[PDB]
Write a protein that binds this ligand. Structure first.
Ligand SMILES: Cc1cc2nc3c(=O)[nH]c(=O)nc-3n(C[C@H](O)[C@H](O)[C@H](O)COP(=O)(O)O)c2cc1C
Ligand SMILES: Cc1cc2nc3c(=O)[nH]c(=O)nc-3n(C[C@H](O)[C@H](O)[C@H](O)COP(=O)(O)O)c2cc1C
Lengths: 358, 358
């Protein structure tokens, strides 16, 4: 099952292995470079059917850190062209996750503190969010409450980002509405205390996300997969209520043209108790897939080939996202093919490699 | 031992893992491209201390196949510059093997026949060698016997190639005098039947190789490792006599400025019986190292970490060459570090990967 092709709209993936977006923190002023080119081209040659580029900021203040990639200008977008072309040359589908970090923005790289940048550090910047409330813990900075014009501008930033991704050659797009960043924070009652049209009720909290999706849909080709990542629960003691609302939003996403949903955890606040475990997201993703009748993918621990295979065979997911295993071994798809006893497993790789490994 | 640094001349390798030259057959008219750039940069980031670029032809007719890389012009050399710089940026030492296929030239890619190109194929060309005798088997073409001027020209081609490698930024060079190609064929009595100064006696058969080394030494920096690969035996029923002569030549190489010898098998003729096995070259390399008092490396089956470690600890080799395992997994060095229980094994890789794998 892991090596069966998958067709969504006009795009066909050679297998069900998806490399989820994984920040590299190697960009400068949002511009990607040879780190990203080699990293991504190398992964594409590894055999995966889909390669989704890391969270790319739609605006400067939407970066998580000073090392995050951006696509807030045509120059930023053009930098992606040679990479997109190399990914296609390798036979993998090029995708990209566009995002805005919201209150979790202006933070240090993970190996450089992983915390909000100091007030007197020249690299930092003011964060924006639905309400002026801090995440807490290692991200204590209180963000600035967005005005209606800030909301209009951020939506347009997402539109510009999607238009740029389209013209750069990407064939798959993912809106980052998860992990406590801007989109996720608008949906969660923990972070959204607004009393206007963008806060309060389920309809109001969903508004920013739905309007952004609709706005993006106007510029994103209808024959190319339009997707999003969304945290459907927080493990904050309100899981049943939260999951029910999240599933309802997933239904609205589908009706609004979403082709597939990447199911994740919210990470909206720090006071939670997440039951980490191999493929622990499987059951949750399956319920969303079933109740919203929408294709899904999920991640965490699927680097074990048999787990990926099992999840697909049980129809818990349509695509299996494998992250860290690809950082350890960019040719994981080849390792997986061997593990599952696929015929001519070495040919998951290009001839220059395959010929000698068969 | 595998992760102990190694200093040769002014160059210091971060560990004892060497990626031996491995043809990719992806060049066009000798010009390398993004296949090579991503392939090599990716391998450098994998952690290996030394990365030796594939056999690069010193002349067009010296290519093994139409897909072989070349460095017979300054334009060809300049194409290597960005790759060399990416390898250095990753902290690996950039090396390159310069070569001339001799009678084994003008052959099809391994996955496209692996045999001598048909007479009426527009991609083929006449081969040259010490004597007009064919390898046989899948390489039946009888090569043209070289004139003294052909020999003078090929030597100059090696000099030009080394000068170009130097100016491109390479910090390690390897002369390809093995695997039945031109250099190896001049030394072997099987292929060399000349009756002039370049054939007959041990001194005459060694002449082409020694003169080429001396010529290259004039342009190659004295503070950068000058090495060569040489087949010390053929497994043709004349191993003791052949090994004795090969060791004597190794002594002449050392006296002539060779800093390290990559020990291999001759592959000069097809009628042999090679005892393939994991690290089977270990004992032979050790004897050459001991009797010629020259640093050495060897390959075949060292992809098993414990074998590489064992070979180093027993002083059979100074560097361990790991080939195919790197095609399967460009991050083999990381796999090896874990296998051998190295402290902070994930940091064999760059921060963007290491931080998440520790
Ligand atoms: C270095 C690194 C960068 C990541 N970057 C992103 C990102 O930009 N956007 C996102 O939605 N998830 C991101 N994630 C979470 C991964 O996409 C994935 O869901 C997670 O690693 C769990 O899968 P795994 O167990 O296969 O690694 C990242 C994870 C790591 C380790
Ligand atoms: C694709 C491929 C290309 C190779 N190219 C070269 C070359 O250009 N020059 C050379 O001396 N040896 C070459 N070799 C032989 C390797 O350097 C190495 O000695 C051999 O693969 C044995 O080591 P391994 O068991 O670790 O793969 C090649 C081997 C493979 C599989």
């Amino acid at each position: 099952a892991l090596f069966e092709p998958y067709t969504l709209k006009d795009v066909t993936l050679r297998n069900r292995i998806a490399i989820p977006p994984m920040c590299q923190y190697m960009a400068e002023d949002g511009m990607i470079n040879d780190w990203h080119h080699v990293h991504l081209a190398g992964l594409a040659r590894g055999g995966a059917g889909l390669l989704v580029v890391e969270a790319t900021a739609v605006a400067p203040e939407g970066r998580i850190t000073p090392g995050c990639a951006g696509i807030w200008s045509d120059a930023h977008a053009q930098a992606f062209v040679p990479v997109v072309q190399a990914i296609k040359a390798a036979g993998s589908v090029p995708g990209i996750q566009i995002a805005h970090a919201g209150r979790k923005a202006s933070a240090n790289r993970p190996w450089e503190g992983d915390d909000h940048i100091a007030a007197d550090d020249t690299r930092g910047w003011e964060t924006i969010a639905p309400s002026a409330i801090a995440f807490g813990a290692h991200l204590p900075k209180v963000p600035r409450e967005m005005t209606l014009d800030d909301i209009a501008r951020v939506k347009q930033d997402f539109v510009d980002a999607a238009r740029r991704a389209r013209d750069a050659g990407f064939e798959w797009i993912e809106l980052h509405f998860a992990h406590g960043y801007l989109g996720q924070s608008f949906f969660s009652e923990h972070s959204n205390k607004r009393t206007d049209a963008y806060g309060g009720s389920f309809d109001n909290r969903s508004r920013f996300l739905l309007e952004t999706l609709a706005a993006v849909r106007e510029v994103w080709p209808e024959n190319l997969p339009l997707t999003a990542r969304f945290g459907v629960l927080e493990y904050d003691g309100r899981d049943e209520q939260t999951l029910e609302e999240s599933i309802e939003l997933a239904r609205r996403f589908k009706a609004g043209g979403l082709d597939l949903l990447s199911v994740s955890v919210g990470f909206t606040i720090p006071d939670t108790n997440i039951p980490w475990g191999p493929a622990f997201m499987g059951p949750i993703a399956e319920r969303v897939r079933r109740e919203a009748k929408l294709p899904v993918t999920s991640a965490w621990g699927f680097g074990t080939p048999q787990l990926a295979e099992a999840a697909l065979q049980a129809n818990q997911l349509d695509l299996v996202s494998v992250g860290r295993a690809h950082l350890a071994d960019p040719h994981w798809a080849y390792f997986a093919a061997k593990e599952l006893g696929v015929e001519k497993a070495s040919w998951t790789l290009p001839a220059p490699y395959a010929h000698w490994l068969e």
